[PDB]
Enzyme design. Structure first.
Site, PDB file in Angstrom:
ATOM      1  N   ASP A  35       0.841  -1.194   0.000  1.00  0.00           N
ATOM      2  CA  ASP A  35       0.000   0.000   0.000  1.00  0.00           C
ATOM      3  C   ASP A  35       0.878   1.247   0.000  1.00  0.00           C
ATOM      4  O   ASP A  35       1.381   1.658   1.056  1.00  0.00           O
ATOM      5  CB  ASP A  35      -0.884  -0.013   1.240  1.00  0.00           C
ATOM      6  N   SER A 199      -0.532  15.591 -12.032  1.00  0.00           N
ATOM      7  CA  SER A 199      -0.770  15.233 -13.422  1.00  0.00           C
ATOM      8  C   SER A 199      -1.026  16.488 -14.247  1.00  0.00           C
ATOM      9  O   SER A 199      -1.573  17.478 -13.761  1.00  0.00           O
ATOM     10  CB  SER A 199      -1.967  14.285 -13.508  1.00  0.00           C
TER      11      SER A 199
END
Length: 330
Positions: A35, A199
């Protein structure tokens, strides 16, 4: 040193991925959910409330000659999905794919929430976010990666998750045969303890690329792709019959639909998520309403590039003094 381990989807939907981890001496192999959005290595154990164990493999520290109680240490974690777990702490030897760390904090669960109990395939979590998020008190502990870093040939790990197939986690090296083209690296902020990056935009299907900054985290422990409501609405508007369902808890679409791809930007590069990666199947057995793999982050507080996005790429988690993320197509 290096390590390399295969990671395997837990079910036919790629809801999560499990990776075998050796703990203790002799080794006890548990299948953990790696994770990158958390920083605790915790396991089902001989200490877990018996009614809360249902098929998981447990770590028994009393059977490990290298286990040592970390005196006074406790842990307690709550995850973004509302699940939780807590317990005490041992140090022990932990190996992943041939890479061994001695003195790793292994957090033994005394209690786990129902979602963990109900998933018999996941024996615990191995956190790979920054150690500042580790929940051990009163002395915070280091992640497996942080402990291994100095020994690694290069201070990196890579995630290569499969679509409906096994994939690989590598530590200490970048497998140049595992991706196509080049890796585009992008800056990381560690201010929230995550692999947080920005992004450069998105496209829906064959549509034009929209240049827009989208801050979010690279999180292998989250199944879906959670993005701003404007972006998600633009995606699902291209799927006839798709709608946001308050009762189901997100966007659903007719199972008869063919989904468009979704592209996200990494600098000047582009990662394309095929439409079929966004199909999470019937909302309940036999239903013709299917659950979408791109969902709004509006109620989360952060955008999350979960497995839906990451499995479309070869992803480098570069833990150099100034960390960065790398993405390549594959």
């Amino acid at each position: 040193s290096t390590g390399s381990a295969t990671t395997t989807p837990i079910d036919s939907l790629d809801d999560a991925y499990i990776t075998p981890v050796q703990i203790g001496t002799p080794a006890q192999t548990l299948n953990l959910d790696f994770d990158t959005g958390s920083s605790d290595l915790w396991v089902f154990s001989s200490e877990t409330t018996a009614s809360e164990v249902d098929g998981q493999t447990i770590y028994t520290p009393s059977k490990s000659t290298t286990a040592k109680l970390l005196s006074g240490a406790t842990w307690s974690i709550s995850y973004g999905d509302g699940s939780s777990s807590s317990g005490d702490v041992y140090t022990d030897t932990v190996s992943v794919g041939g890479l061994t760390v001695t003195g790793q904090a292994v957090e033994s669960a005394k209690k786990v929430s129902s979602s963990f109990t109900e998933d018999s395939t996941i024996d615990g979590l191995l956190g790979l976010a920054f150690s500042t998020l580790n929940t051990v008190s009163p002395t915070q502990q280091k992640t497996f990666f942080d402990n291994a870093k100095a020994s690694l040939d290069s201070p990196v790990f890579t995630a290569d998750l499969g679509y409906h197939a096994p994939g690989t986690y590598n530590f200490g090296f970048i497998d140049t045969t595992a991706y196509t083209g080049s890796i585009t690296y992008t800056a990381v902020s560690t201010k929230q303890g995550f692999w947080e990056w920005t992004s450069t935009g998105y496209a829906v299907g064959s549509g034009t690329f929209k240049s827009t900054s989208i801050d979010g985290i690279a999180d292998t422990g989250t199944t879906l792709l959670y993005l701003p409501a404007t972006v998600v609405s633009a995606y699902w508007a291209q799927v006839s019959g798709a709608k946001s369902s308050s009762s189901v808890g997100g966007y659903v679409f007719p199972c008869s639909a063919t989904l468009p791809s979704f592209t996200f930007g990494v600098g000047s590069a582009r990662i394309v998520i095929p439409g079929d990666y966004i199909d999470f199947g019937p909302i309940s057995t036999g239903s013709s309403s299917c659950f979408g793999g791109i969902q709004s982050s509006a109620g989360i507080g952060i955008n999350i590039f979960g497995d839906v996005a990451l499995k479309a790429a070869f992803v480098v988690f570069n833990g150099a003094t100034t960390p960065t993320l790398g993405f390549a197509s594959k």
